[PDB]
Amino acid sequence: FDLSGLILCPVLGSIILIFIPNSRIRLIRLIGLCASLITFLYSLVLWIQFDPSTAKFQFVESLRWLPYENINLNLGIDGLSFFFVILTTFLIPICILVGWSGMRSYGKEYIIAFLICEFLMIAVFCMLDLLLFYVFFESVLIPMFIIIGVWGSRQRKIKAAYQFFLYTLLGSVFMLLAILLILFQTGTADLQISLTTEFSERRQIFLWIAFFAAFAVKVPMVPVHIWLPEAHVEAPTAGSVILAGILSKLGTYGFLRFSIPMFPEATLCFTPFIYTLSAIAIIYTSLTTLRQIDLKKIIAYSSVAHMNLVTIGMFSLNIQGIGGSILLMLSHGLVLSALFLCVGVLYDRHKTRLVRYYGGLVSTMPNFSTIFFFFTLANMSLPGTSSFIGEFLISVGAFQRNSLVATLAALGMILGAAYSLWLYNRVVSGNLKADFLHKFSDLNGREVFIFIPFLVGVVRMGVHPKVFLDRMHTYVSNLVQHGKFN
Amino acid sequence: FIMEFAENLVLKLMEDPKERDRRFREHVYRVKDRCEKTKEMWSYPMRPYGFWTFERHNSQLAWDAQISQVPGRRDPYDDLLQHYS
Numbered sequence: 001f002d003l004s005g006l007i008l009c010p011v012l013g014s015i016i017l018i019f020i021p022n023s024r025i026r027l028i029r030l031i032g033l034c035a036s037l038i039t040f041l042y043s044l045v046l047w048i049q050f051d052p053s054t055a056k057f058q059f060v061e062s063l064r065w066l067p068y069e070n071i072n073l074n075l076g077i078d079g080l081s082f083f084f085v086i087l088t089t090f091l092i093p094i095c096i097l098v099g100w101s102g103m104r105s106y107g108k109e110y111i112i113a114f115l116i117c118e119f120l121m122i123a124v125f126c127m128l129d130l131l132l133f134y135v136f137f138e139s140v141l142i143p144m145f146i147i148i149g150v151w152g153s154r155q156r157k158i159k160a161a162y163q164f165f166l167y168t169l170l171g172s173v174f175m176l177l178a179i180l181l182i183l184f185q186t187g188t189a190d191l192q193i194s195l196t197t198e199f200s201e202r203r204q205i206f207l208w209i210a211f212f213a214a215f216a217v218k219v220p221m222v223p224v225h226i227w228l229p230e231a232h233v234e235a236p237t238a239g240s241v242i243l244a245g246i247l248s249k250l251g252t253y254g255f256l257r258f259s260i261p262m263f264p265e266a267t268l269c270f271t272p273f274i275y276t277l278s279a280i281a282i283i284y285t286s287l288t289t290l291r292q293i294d295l296k297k298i299i300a301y302s303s304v305a306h307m308n309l310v311t312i313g314m315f316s317l318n319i320q321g322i323g324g325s326i327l328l329m330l331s332h333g334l335v336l337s338a339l340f341l342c343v344g345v346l347y348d349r350h351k352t353r354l355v356r357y358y359g360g361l362v363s364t365m366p367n368f369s370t371i372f373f374f375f376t377l378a379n380m381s382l383p384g385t386s387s388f389i390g391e392f393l394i395s396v397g398a399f400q401r402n403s404l405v406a407t408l409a410a411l412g413m414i415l416g417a418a419y420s421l422w423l424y425n426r427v428v429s430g431n432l433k434a435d436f437l438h439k440f441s442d443l444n445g446r447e448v449f450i451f452i453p454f455l456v457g458v459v460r461m462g463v464h465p466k467v468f469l470d471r472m473h474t475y476v477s478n479l480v481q482h483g484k485f486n
Numbered sequence: 487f488i489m490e491f492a493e494n495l496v497l498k499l500m501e502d503p504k505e506r507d508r509r510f511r512e513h514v515y516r517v518k519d520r521c522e523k524t525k526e527m528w529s530y531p532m533r534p535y536g537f538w539t540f541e542r543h544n545s546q547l548a549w550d551a552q553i554s555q556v557p558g559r560r561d562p563y564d565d566l567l568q569h570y571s
Contacts, residue, residue, distance in 0.1 A: 049496065
């Protein structure tokens with residue numbers, strides 16, 4: 001039961017699908033789903049054997065990549081990456097389950113791309129080498145770009161893919177410069193040595209600036225968020241699920257893992273900068289979410305706002321703030337996936353995204369209305385939900401650190417309770433528009449089952465977040481204690 | 487007894503903390519030694535110190551010492567004296 005086995009599980013299924021004719025769509029679907037579910041169960045078995053007491057990386061595995069230059073492949077988890085590994089491994093089979101009905105048109109390339117993306121995600125999150133972490137960090141760029149371009153709804157998919165690729169490439173390239181500078185300075189790219197080595201204050205500032213640019217391309221900040229709504233709008237529903245609950249979480253993971261502990265003085269110097277960026281992004285993005293006409297754009301801007309709340313919660317360098325950041329990362333991955341699944345269901349039924357056509361879906365889709373109401377509540381961060389747990393812990397940390405930025409972040413509550421309610425009322429409440437839409441169908445068995453794990457996860461992480469919280473207190477404490485020796 | 491068996495199985499899973507700490511210490515020490523070794527490897531200049539004294543680089547001297555008696559490059563007085571004796 002090892003991380004190498006976890007990484008290799010998608011590879012075997014991917015190869016099997018590559019070497020199967022496209023005419024056996026039933027076999028392709030079944031084998032892809034079986035591989036995804038087997039990997040999910042394997043990750044759960046990895047969960048039931050995780051030690052939350054030690055601060056060292058648990059399942060460290062070493063492979064000889066380059067015997068010289070100290071770029072050997074190190075695979076390991078410590079508690080923060082672990083829930084992200086579980087989240088990706090759980091979210092991948094949902095993507096196959098979504099395209100189950102019309103998978104012949106998608107072809108086996110769809111499942112192969114998603115399995116390769118899963119392989120890349122597990123490789124990113126299970127990594128103790130800076131250079132290899134960057135390698136897989138930028139590897140994830142291929143499958144998502146191909147997915148968005150090939151399986152996009154309309155011709156704007158080309159522009160969306162171009163923007164996504166160019167932004168992420170620029171960020172990754174600057175990160176590569178910084179990483180190679182660190183390699184030349186220290187003699188190795190190993191995470192432990194990089195954490196235990198000093199850097200000059202000017203060198204710390206420059207390296208942190210490069211890392212911040214790279215990760216702020218991923219986690220949407222004020223100037224570089226405009227590529228995300230278009231990417232979600234033009235990507236398919238499964239691609240949107242992945243890009244919302246997986247890649248942004250990758251970015252914030254990379255930021256939290258390689259920026260805060262590696263450069264303490266630089267983080268302290270730049271802490272007000274990210275506070276003001278996050279407050280401005282939260283307020284502006286919530287307000288521009290209020291005045292939107294596209295469902296995918298609305299949930300994408302909600303993603304931007306909540307990711308900026310996450311990044312406002314990390315530099316609150318305390319247990320409450322960092323734990324809330326991680327918990328809201330997981331919760332927002334689940335909630336974004338669920339909301340994009342609801343919008344994808346609506347699009348698959350009625351091939352439109354404008355909310356002007358939609359209205360009064362209670363009378364025709366009551367199960368969908370209930371699911372949409374619950375997930376809009378989760379996005380709103382109602383108490384008793386994982387998003388509320390994360391948001392309140394983040395706000396507690398922000399108030400313990402800086403009251404002004406805490407209040408600015410808490411202003412997001414009113415705005416997030418506005419657009420969510422107003423969108424839900426538009427789409428679900430009201431009277432039917434028989435001239436626009438006159439044939440309806442409620443959620444079928446497959447979609448209902450797909451929504452089941454999301455509800456259970458949200459409720460379990462909201463009512464009783466003790467398991468998730470206790471699985472990471474040791475790492476959070478060690479991360480905050482890294483810089484000081486008192 | 488089901489819970490007891492489950493606890494025993496979980497304990498059979500996981501990793502020994504002592505072995506984990508020992509492996510961590512060994513790996514960190516190995517990485518530190520190898521990284522200082524690679525730094526000292528990179529510190530060497532491209533042009534070596536003794537390159538002007540190397541036999542491969544001083545290859546013209548041996549050939550010209552061998553070939554110094556060829557009439558195309560003979561000192562005239564040497565030819566004169568070898569004619570005289």
